[PDB]
């Protein structure tokens, strides 16, 4: 499976940004899509996850008021694979939010650890400046 | 709360094991037209018995789930149990081992015959 | 770790398979012999399959082949007890009836007794009549005489379509595609399982698909290959277009004995003015329908000008639209329907003719004589889809041309069976577990 | 006694005879249909027993609790005061429900037995 | 190996191949074809019904409580298992086979009565 993301762009403080995550080679609806942030002053941090199957999402308390996650309807390629995309929107950007943002694929369809980010996209840089 | 017939087909293999009885039941239940109906009835019987013939030979008859003494060969699949039971449908799994299905069946039959031979000998020694 | 094979029974899997299907039907006889069918379940079951995507291909669907063979086999079964009409192939003397749609013919027919003959006067449709090669113009023969014996349809057996539910043998299942935009091929996201199909009426027609299912939201155009003009294009309409058909002629039907156990039915007279049979399609509704079809065709053809045209010529059975109404077989000129041109930017009356000697499946050596139906026939039906073909051989970047009909009768069944696929259920499967069998003693 | 000889006897009395009853061109076509029909009925009952795990036994205890709504009768009222024919009428609307519960219990039992073996 | 490849082998040696023959017992003219298909099923089921009656269902080898009658054969186990084929063995007891089958059925009937207690 493979994941790719929207390219890096510069934003003003308070601006919104939307990051796409196109996927292929696996069934989109079978796995959770995770979003994870890394910054130099914080290290890795979860922004929560969304299930394309039910539309349910679990947002981390830090991001509940600033992050919205949505998904596209999957388009099949083979009986066992499909294409589709997840999107994340961040509002009220601050300089503290600068860093690399990653899209990642859930680990299992069942069991205790289904949402773990087994596959990661390359990730892209978000920059904030006035 | 049942998913209905084949409702589990899209489920993971582990989840699907919950519904085996749904599929097991109705295998028998679900003039030009008259002959076609007769052929349909005979065919359904042959279909049902084909699988039962294998189970009786394997010693698995009367059971929905039957453990055996035949070791798994990594060449049939190198997947871990989590990769199989929690990440696959049975439809996907059958394709992965489609070339080995008959090989496995013969190994099960050989193991059953040796087991019964040994059980008899253990009783003869008593 | 040490893993062992474990046997599971009742595993929810399937593989594509071809198996004999049998009819079921909802609880004076009919050619389809639906009374022989298994009664339908009063509460049919359907199971939605979540997380299942499956490949469908209506063009390779063998349910079509079985239905086609069933329809022919039943047709023949209905004719086995019926009158052979072998004595009917005689020299006819014919004159004009007191347009040449009809001729008044005279012949010496056989009787109950071998040593006796009777003179018979009868009206025949010109389509059933062939001049003697001597070309005197006063003598004729029936068209079948150099080809086949004609079996008379039994007058007590109806040709009316009755819905047939196709059911698969136990241990097999029929998958149904529910996708709203489904074109009959490719992957279907919404898949469900049924033991039987929805009831399908065995409607036989040549250019327009009558009394079939409707598309739920949009017009769906289906083809094995749109770019290849040779392939038939099946168009399913969202809305029905009402077509009304009438035979104004008031027939008086008479009958004579041919021999012991046999009788011949023929039109002895017509009451009132003789008038040509015709069908009516509302013009405004039809033009709306064609526009919507053209809009969908332009999507596949690069927004080229869409031209509709009349049939290519050749035999009447192909070049005209046909249907069974009132037990009579009609052939109608559809050039009034397909004469439009469309760009990116009252009623239509279709002349019809009636033919009593037919060969619906185009089989060599076969023929049927429909008996005339007394009085005046009127009926109504819904156009629910179109059969189109395309003119190839052109590199033009402006025009595309479409024409009604096609050579293959099997394509009618495809318009209803595109949703369905037959699969075999395989209850056994094997997968590794940590479980090891215990051995007694 | 004989085949169905116990039919007028009480349900309890009948239990001894289950072993006995456990057993058992135109004309040629009818015989073919007769042969197929006999096979379908034999297998129909065996199919249910195999799923229930009761195969090979005339009497098979299960883990499904009796629901008093199916019958409020005591065991003495059922086993000694009724024929099987009378009993069949009393539970005619619940028989399919009971069958499904037996099947669900069998699948849960085998799943649990598998897990016990995995731990050994 | 192969179907009936053991037929000429000693009865003891042949027992290693029982599964080879246990499998493939299953798998106008339309009537003729159905009669043969039904016949194959009836013979398969006939044998399975006997095993169910004997309490031997699901087993390739099944021990019973019926004692061997020396009048059926006086041969030692070593003579029978290592010096005979199954084809020869069936001929020696061909006239006692139905008697043996009835005795097994009677023994199961007694066992069922005991299990009920
Ligand atoms: C597309 O779909 C549409 C919608 O489904 C289809 O439209 C339907 O088409 C049907 C077939 O044409 C049609 O059914 C026929 O209707 C005729 C007219 O019915 C109306 O008038 C009669 C008489 O007043 C009313 O009773 C009735 O309620 C209606 O108002 C009927 O006459 C037809 O029945 C007769 O023909 C059928 C065969 O087609 C026979 O099986 C049947 O027995 C009838 O024939 C006998 O009776 C007539 C006189 O009624 C005699 O003329 C005839 O010789 C027969 O006589 C014998 O039997 C009678 C007893 O029945 C006995 O007294 C006598 O002595 C003889 O022994 C038939 O019911 C639908 O009405 C029509 N629907 C609509 C809404 O219009 C359309 O066809 C489809 N298109 C295609 C291509 O399939
Ligand atoms: C079709 O395909 C889909 C996708 O593959 C299948 O869906 C998968 O089904 C399995 C069924 O077991 C799921 O496994 C479980 O996953 C959950 C994950 O938690 C999430 O889902 C909950 C759904 O109710 C939801 O409640 C959770 O979120 C709420 O609650 C939390 C906690 O309060 C809160 O933080 C959130 O904000 C929400 O309010 C959350 O979104 C997991 O919890 C389950 O654990 C139990 O079960 C396992 C297995 O027995 C067991 O090991 C555990 O100990 C525990 O008992 C379980 O792991 C899987 O997540 C589904 N996948 C997706 C992508 O949704 C579907 O089943 C398929 N259909 C068919 C017909 O086969
Ligand atoms: C009916 O619907 C299905 C699903 O939408 C259509 O199948 C897919 O159609 C596309 C074209 O629209 C095919 O793409 C092809 O890609 C190759 C390059 O890889 C290109 O050379 C072709 O010209 C074409 O664009 C795609 O393969 C096809 N998928 C399958 C599985 O066949 C289908 O075409 C539709 N049918 C009709 C008659 O429109
Ligand atoms: C198909 O369409 C045609 C054209 O619209 C229909 O023809 C018309 O039918 C009506 C029926 O009442 C005719 O009305 C009457 O005709 C007689 C004829 O002698 C006349 O004397 C009456 O005053 C009255 O006008 C009408 O004339 C006729 N039109 C034509 C041009 O013939 C036809 O009925 C439609 N067919 C069906 C099955 O609906
Ligand atoms: C076809 O018939 C021949 C002759 O009866 C069979 O030959 C015998 O085969 C067995 C093995 O299947 C030999 O057994 C072994 O004998 C040695 C001593 O020679 C002993 O040390 C071993 O423990 C074992 O018992 C047996 O000797 C041999 N007999 C002769 C005379 O050579 C042959 O096996 C038959 N084939 C089949 C497939 O049944
Ligand atoms: C659909 O039909 C078109 C037309 O027949 C096929 O394309 C042709 O393929 C041959 C291959 O040798 C070429 O020489 C032609 O030039 C092609 N025609 C055009 C108009 O491009 C096409 O391959 C068919 N599609 C499928 C899937 O069979
Ligand atoms: C078909 O032709 C015959 C022969 O010309 C017509 O028969 C005559 O019909 C009239 C009534 O119209 C009778 O009075 C005569 O006796 C008939 N002649 C014979 C020899 O039977 C018959 O009418 C014609 N049919 C039609 C519909 O015109
Ligand atoms: C349907 O009706 C039209 C009415 O015009 C018929 O049209 C003629 O067809 C011939 C075919 O060679 C052409 O040469 C003529 O030009 C057409 N019309 C005229 C006025 O010339 C058409 O043939 C009919 N179709 C059938 C199958 O009978
Ligand atoms: C789960 O499966 C994902 C998709 O891979 C497909 O399914 C697996 C089980 C294999 O059969 C593979 O060949 C198929 O293409 C994987 O992307 C994902 O990593 C898997 N998860 C784990 C934990 O293995
Ligand atoms: C595993 O499979 C290989 C062939 O791929 C075979 O040679 C080997 O003997 C097998 N191991 C066992 C234990 O069956
Ligand atoms: C089965 O064997 C064929 C070659 O005969 C091969 O193409 C196919 O990939 C094999 N299937 C699997 C699941 O290995
Ligand atoms: C019958 O009508 C045709 C067509 O008008 C004509 O050619 C023929 O001469 C007519 N026959 C008689 C006897 O008038
Ligand atoms: C019928 O027989 C009569 C006998 O006189 C003859 O005149 C007449 O031409 C015959 N009709 C036909 C069509 O042969
Ligand atoms: C029968 O006669 C018709 C007369 O039009 C002719 O077209 C047809 O070809 C003939 N059939 C044969 C087999 O000669
Ligand atoms: C699948 O089709 C059924 C048809 O009734 C519909 O109710 C259901 O919502 C569909 N599922 C999806 C995901 O569209
Ligand atoms: C077909 O279209 C042409 C061009 O508009 C027109 O002249 C002709 O009369 C039309 N034919 C019919 C039957 O309407
Ligand atoms: C046709 O003529 C007969 C003559 O008896 C009459 O009874 C019948 O009603 C007529 N049909 C119509 C539609 O006028
Ligand atoms: C044709 O469509 C109309 C609605 O426009 C409907 O009332 C009628 O029953 C339909 N006819 C058939 C045969 O379905
Ligand atoms: C397109 O069709 C029109 C008739 O509708 C015709 O006049 C024109 O010449 C055609 N164009 C080409 C390029 O063939
Ligand atoms: C008996 O059946 C009823 C059905 O509604 C159910 O509510 C009740 O819990 C059942 N009792 C037991 C003991 O299972
Ligand atoms: C079962 O239902 C039938 C009606 O279908 C009713 O007559 C009968 O009394 C019911 N049985 C019980 C025990 O309620």
Which CATH number goes with the domain that contains A96? 2.60.40.10
Partner E contacted by B49 (CB < 8 A): yes
Q: What are the backbone angles phi and psi of residue D77, rounded to the nearest 5°?
A: -65, -35
Whether residue C49 has its Cβ less than 6 Å from ligand 15: no
Helix axes C63-79, C410-417, angle to 10 degrees: 130
Here the tokens at position A1 are 């499976």
Three-state SS at A107: coil
Q: What does the DSSP 8-state code read for residue D15?
A: G
Whether residue C178 has its Cβ less than 6 Å from ligand 15: yes
Distance of CA B38 to the CA centre of its chain: 27
Give the number of the atom of ligand 3 that is nearest the alpha carbon of residue C55: 31
* CA distances (Å), origin C283, targets C275, C289, C352: 23, 10, 18
C333 contacts C351 by C-beta, under 8 angstroms: yes
Annotated resolution, angstroms: 3.3
* CA distances (Å), origin C172, targets A7, B4, B55, C14, C427: 50, 15, 20, 9, 11
The Cα of B6 is separated from the nearest Cα of chain D by a number of Å equal to 16
Dihedral of the CA atoms E49, E50, E53, E54 (nearest 10)? -140
Spell out the long-range contacts of C111-115 with Cβ–Cβ below 8 A and sequence spacing 24 or more: C111/C257, C111/C258, C111/C259, C112/C257, C112/C259, C112/C260
**Burial label, C265 (beta-carbon count in 10 A; 0-12, 13-18, 19+):** buried
B21 contacts B64 by C-beta, under 8 angstroms: yes
* DSSP assignment of C96-162: E----SEEEEEEEEE-SSTT-EEEEEEEEEGGGEEE-TT--SSEEEEGGGGT---EEPPTTEE----
Q: Where are the beta strands (DSSP E) in chain D?
A: none
Q: Among all chains, which residue has been given the structure tokens 């279709």?
A: C350
Method: cryo-EM
Distance of CA A97 to the CA centre of its chain: 15
Domain membership of residue A90 as a residue range: 1-130
Q: Among all chains, which residue has been given the structure tokens 């049902």?
A: B48
Whether residue C156 has its Cβ less than 6 Å from ligand 1: no
Cβ separation D107–B48 shorter than 8 A: no
Q: Give the C-alpha separation, A87 to A103, whole Å.
A: 9
Tell me the best of C94, C120, C121, C250 to mutate to test the pocket of ligand 7, counting ligand atoms within 8 Å of each CB and taking the most: C121
The Cα of B5 is separated from the nearest Cα of chain E by a number of Å equal to 27
**Burial label, C33 (beta-carbon count in 10 A; 0-12, 13-18, 19+):** buried
Partner D contacted by C11 (CB < 8 A): no
Q: List the one residue out of C183, C195, C263, C255 whose CA is nearest residue C226.
A: C183
C1 contacts C434 by C-beta, under 8 angstroms: yes
Cβ separation B11–C51 shorter than 8 A: yes
Q: Give the C-alpha separation, D2 to D14, whole Å.
A: 11
Nearest bound ligand to CA C336?
A: 16
Q: Give the C-alpha separation, B19 to B8, whole Å.
A: 7
Of the partner residues C23, C48, C436, the one whose CB lies closest to the CB of residue B67: C436
Residues recorded for chain E: 117
- Adjacent-strand bridge partners of C131: C140
Whether residue A41 has its Cβ less than 6 Å from ligand 2: no
Those residues whose C-beta lies under 8 Å from the C-beta of residue C392, and which sit 6 or more positions away, are C228, C229, C230
Q: Give the C-alpha separation, A12 to A7, whole Å.
A: 17
D85 contacts D9 by C-beta, under 8 angstroms: no
Dihedral of the CA atoms C15, C16, C18, C19 (nearest 10)? 40
Q: Per the structure, how many domains does chain A have?
A: 1
Partner D contacted by B64 (CB < 8 A): yes
For chain B, the chains sharing at least 3 beta-carbon pairs closer than 8 angstroms are A, C, D, E
Burial readout A22-34 (b: 16 or more C-beta within 10 A, e: otherwise) = bbeebbbbbbbbb
**Burial label, C317 (beta-carbon count in 10 A; 0-12, 13-18, 19+):** middle
Name the region of C100 (left: φ>0; alpha: ψ -120 to 50; beta: rest): left
Q: Give the C-alpha separation, C144 to C84, whole Å.
A: 12
Q: List the one residue out of E41, E39, E60, E56 whose CA is nearest residue E101.
A: E56
Here the tokens at position C203 are 């409607």
Q: What are the backbone angles phi and psi of residue D27, rounded to the nearest 5°?
A: -70, -35
Nearest bound ligand to CA C331?
A: 8
**Burial label, C133 (beta-carbon count in 10 A; 0-12, 13-18, 19+):** exposed
C261 contacts C97 by C-beta, under 8 angstroms: no
How does strand C102-110 pair with strand C92-96?
antiparallel
Q: Give the C-alpha separation, C225 to A78, whole Å.
A: 20
Return the number of CB contacts < 8 Å for A and C: 15
Those residues whose C-beta lies under 8 Å from the C-beta of residue C71, and which sit 6 or more positions away, are C202, C204
The closest residue, in CA terms, to atom 17 on ligand 9 is: A1
Angle at E9 between CA E6 and CA E14, to 5 degrees: 60
Cα dihedral E69, E72, E75, E77 sign: negative
Q: Helix, strand, coil % (nearest 5) of chain A? A: 5, 55, 40
Burial readout D3-29 (b: 16 or more C-beta within 10 A, e: otherwise) = eeebeeebbeebbebeeebeeeeeeee
* CA distances (Å), origin B95, targets B101, C3, C14, C191, D9: 10, 20, 11, 20, 56
Give the number of the atom of ligand 10 that is nearest the alpha carbon of residue B74: 1
Q: Give the C-alpha separation, C258 to C114, whole Å.
A: 10
* CA distances (Å), origin C275, targets A114, B16, B38, C351, C376: 76, 68, 51, 11, 11
Cβ separation A29–C51 shorter than 8 A: yes
Partner D contacted by C6 (CB < 8 A): yes
Q: How many CA atoms, within 13 angstroms, populate the side-chain half-sphere of residue C328?
A: 27
Q: Give the C-alpha separation, A46 to A48, whole Å.
A: 5
Cα dihedral C145, C146, C149, C150 sign: negative
Q: Give the C-alpha separation, A127 to A113, whole Å.
A: 33
Whether residue C329 has its Cβ less than 6 Å from ligand 1: no
* CA distances (Å), origin C330, targets A120, C204, C362: 67, 12, 16
Pick among A110, A114, A115 to test the B interface (most B CBs inside 10 A)? A110
């Amino acid at each position: 499976g493979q994941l790719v993301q929207s390219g890096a762009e510069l934003k003003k403080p308070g601006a919104s940004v939307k990051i796409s995550c196109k996927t292929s080679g696996y069934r989109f609806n079978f796995y959770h899509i995770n979003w994870i942030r890394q910054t130099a002053g914080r290290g890795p941090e979860w922004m929560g996850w969304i299930s394309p199957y039910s539309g349910d999402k679990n947002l981390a308390p830090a991001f509940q008021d600033r992050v919205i996650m949505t998904t596209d309807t999957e388009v099949p390629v083979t009986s066992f694979t499909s294409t589709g995309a997840a999107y994340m929107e961040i509002r009220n950007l601050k300089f503290d939010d600068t860093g690399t943002y990653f899209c990642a694929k859930g680990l299992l369809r069942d069991g205790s650890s289904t949402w773990l980010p087994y596959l990661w996209g390359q990730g892209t840089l978000l920059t904030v400046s006035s | 709360v049942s998913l209905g017939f084949l409702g589990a087909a899209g489920s993971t293999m582990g989840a699907a094991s919950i519904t085996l009885t749904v599929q097991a039941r109705q295998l028998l239940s679900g003039t030009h037209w008259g002959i076609k109906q007769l052929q349909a009835r005979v065919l359904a019987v042959e279909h049902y018995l084909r699988d039962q013939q294998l189970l009786g030979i394997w010693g698995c008859s009367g059971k929905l789930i039957c453990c055996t003494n035949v070791p798994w060969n990594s060449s049939w699949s190198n997947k871990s149990l989590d990769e199989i039971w929690n990440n696959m449908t049975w439809l996907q799994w059958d394709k992965e081992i489609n070339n080995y299905t008959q090989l496995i069946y013969r190994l099960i039959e050989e193991s059953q015959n040796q087991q019964e031979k040994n059980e008899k000998e253990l009783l003869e020694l008593d | 770790e040490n893993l062992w094979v474990t046997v599971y029974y009742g595993v929810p899997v399937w593989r594509d398979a071809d198996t004999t299907l049998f009819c079921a039907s909802d609880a004076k006889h009919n050619v389809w012999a639906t009374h022989a069918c298994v009664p339908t379940d009063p509460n049919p079951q359907e199971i939605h399959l979540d997380n299942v995507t499956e490949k469908f291909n209506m063009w390779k669907n063998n349910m079509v082949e079985q239905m086609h063979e069933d329809i022919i086999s039943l047709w023949d079964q209905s004719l086995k007890p019926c009158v052979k009409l072998t004595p009917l192939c005689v020299t006819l003397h014919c004159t004009n009836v007191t347009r040449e749609g009809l001729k008044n013919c005279s012949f010496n027919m056989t009787t109950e007794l071998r040593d006796k003959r009777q003179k018979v006067y009868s009206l025949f449709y010109r389509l059933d009549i062939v001049p003697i090669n001597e070309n005197q113009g006063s003598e004729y023969r029936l068209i079948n005489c150099n080809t086949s014996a004609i079996t008379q349809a039994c007058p007590k057996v109806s040709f009316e379509p009755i819905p047939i539910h196709y059911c698969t043998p136990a241990g097999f299942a029929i998958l149904k595609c529910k996708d709203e935009g489904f074109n009959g091929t490719g992957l279907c996201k919404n898949v469900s399982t049924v033991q039987c199909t929805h009831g399908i009426k065995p409607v036989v027609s040549t250019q327009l698909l009558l009394n079939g299912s409707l598309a739920e939201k949009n017009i769906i155009i289906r083809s094995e290959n749109i770019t290849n003009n040779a392939k038939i294009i099946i168009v399913q309409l969202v809305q029905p277009v009402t077509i009304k058909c009438i035979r104004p002629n008031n027939n008086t039907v008479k009958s004579i004995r041919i021999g012991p156990g046999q009788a011949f039915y023929y039109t002895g007279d017509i009451i009132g003015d003789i008038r040509q049979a015709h069908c009516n399609v509302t013009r405004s509704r039809w033009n709306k329908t064609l526009q919507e079809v053209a809009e969908k065709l332009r999507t596949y053809f690069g927004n080229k000008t869409i031209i509709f045209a009349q049939s290519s010529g050749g035999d009447l059975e192909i070049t005209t639209h046909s249907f069974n109404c009132g037990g009579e077989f009609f052939y109608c000129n559809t050039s009034g329907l397909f004469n439009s041109t469309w760009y990116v930017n009252d009623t239509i009356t279709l002349p019809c003719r009636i033919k009593q000697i037919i060969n619906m499946w185009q089989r060599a050596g076969q023929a049927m004589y429909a008996p005339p139906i007394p009085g005046v026939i009127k009926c109504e039906s819904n156009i629910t889809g179109l059969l189109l073909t395309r003119d190839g051989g052109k590199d033009n970047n402006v025009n595309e041309t479409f024409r009604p009909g096609g050579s293959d009768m099997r394509d009618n069944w495809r318009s209803e069976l595109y949703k369905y696929k037959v699969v075999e259920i395989e209850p056994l499967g094997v997968a590794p577990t940590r479980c090891k069998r215990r051995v007694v003693e």
